[PDB]
Amino acid sequence: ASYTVKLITPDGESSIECSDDTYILDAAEEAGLDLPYSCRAGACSTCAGKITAGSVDQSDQSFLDDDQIEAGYVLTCVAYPTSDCTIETHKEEDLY
């Protein structure tokens, strides 16, 4: 289970279900492009999850995550409960 739903990085559709916390670019962006999560908001743009619509950060607080509990749009590389992960175009390095 876990790590299986859908994501999309330089390696388009990736599988992620994070039914055990995590999801972070590590699940996808690292499954094929290795990129740990730490820089924190205001430090990078690699974690631009486009509609994570899955991993529920929960501990958003001041740190960026999902806006409140469902929005990969922000740096969601530090979520908490993860009811399925859905990050598309987490960061195409262009922002079409």
Q: Where are the domains of the chain?
A: 1-96
Sign of CA dihedral 87, 90, 95, 96: negative
Burial 20-59 (b: 16+ CB within 10 A, else e): eebbbbbbbbebeeebebeeeeeebebbbbbebbbbbbee
18 annotated as ligand-binding: no
- Superfamily of chain region 1-96: Beta-grasp domain (3.10.20.30)
**Distance of alpha carbon 72 from alpha carbon 95, whole angstroms:** 14
CA atoms within 13 A on the CB side of 20: 6
Retrieve residue 24's tokens: 């972070």
Experimental method: NMR
Tally of CA atoms within 13 A in the half-sphere of 86 that contains its CB: 9
85 annotated among ligand-binding-site residues: no
Cα–Cα distances (Å) from 13 to 44, 69, 73, 84, 87, in that order, read: 22, 22, 17, 14, 9
Q: What is the dihedral of CA 20, 21, 27, 29, to 10 degrees?
A: 160
